[model samples]
Target: MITFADYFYQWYEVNKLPHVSESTKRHYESAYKHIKDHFRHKLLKDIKRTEYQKFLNEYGLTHSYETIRKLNSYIRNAFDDAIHEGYVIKNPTYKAELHASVLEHHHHHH
Candidate 1:
């Protein structure tokens, strides 16, 4: 069975790493690390949209909206491929929401 980590790494190595420029690859690597840490043991087929949303909400506690968007892109893209390969029926991140930095909001208000 293909775990979430397994498919992510497969996509990262086989499809993503080679196609992106070095800088973008490094950026992706950082996001990949976070995703791997969280979902490494999870089976791709078992993950639900609500669970993925909670994960994003929790991750948003420390991450900015922009960063989460970037990370979401990676996960979403991987899920897209997973769908194409018949690994999953739906993309969990399809309706995920990103949180903006509180500091950014505060700064703007001042």
Candidate 2:
């Protein structure tokens, strides 16, 4: 079985990166970096819903909701292809929850 990173780079550079708009391309690349950083050589079959949610929780610590959403979107897209090719079974990101928005704290005390 191919490691998630192996398959992700394959699909990303070929199937994804070449076709997206230039501005959006950067966003996707950023999202991919998060996945690559976390998952590393994890096998596609070894990832599950719980693991994915934990990854999101930690990633959300510094990122805003929108940033987390973009990351999840890219991950979901990759998993979709992984499933089709039998590299993955069920989608690990299904029903995965994104963390709440991390808005800049507004000073309340006057």
Candidate 3:
């Protein structure tokens, strides 16, 4: 399948840091691999915030919320890298928390 994982690996191949420290690149690459497994069949363009957030919800429910947040950070940074490389006009993960404030307000709402 032409999945998000494939696209992400491609993006990393062309854009992963050569200017930065090896540790940083290793950290980012590891994070990318971690996300790739869960998003195994997701399409690049169709990787909407809703889909990722849904994954985060399920993952957070089963795993640590901290881990979800950390992975989300990694996912966001990966897309940001793609944006910087001119592969994409925008980072789909940039507005990842679109529902955060809304969710908060609703939680406190009567």
Candidate 4:
């Protein structure tokens, strides 16, 4: 599978991450594993706006809003990297708004 780890390690190797802290890399590695597992076998190009928003709603049910926001931010960055690497023409996560209410409350963060 062209998993998240596969993409990340590819990035790490290419970037020559000797400047990145070990602790930071460790945390990223953990998060990368979760992201990979969460979207295993899924195509980034096929991620619909509603599907990812639903992922947030379901996964963030009990989590803090900021936490959910952070997850989305990470997802965005990953999509951005994929685009930079020519994996896709654009990031799908950018296509949808969060829940309408949440979007209203969070517009200031934009």
- lDDT tens digits, residues 1-109, model 3? 3466777666556665555577666655665665576777766556777667665655555445444566577667666765676655435664454233213244455
Could you tell me which residue pairs clash in candidate 4? none
Cα lDDT of model 1 by residue, 18-52, tens digit: 77788887667766666677778888877788878
Give the Å shift of residue 30 in candidate 1: 2.2
In model 1, the Cα lDDT at residue 63 comes to 71
Candidate with the greatest TM-score versus the true structure: 1
Off-target runs (Cα >4 Å) in candidate 3 are: 7-34, 94-110
**Which consecutive 10 residues in model 3 have the weakest lDDT in total?**
97-106
Question: Which ranges in model 4 have alpha carbons more than 4 Å from their true place?
Answer: 1-38, 95-110
Per-residue lDDT, model 2, residue 47, is 83
| Runs in model 1 lying further than 4 Å from the true structure | 101-110
- Native-referenced Cα lDDT, model 4: 0.59
Tens digits of lDDT, candidate 2, 2-82: 777666767777897778787876676666677677778888778888888888887787688888887787778888877
> Between prediction 1 and prediction 3, which has the larger TM-score?
1
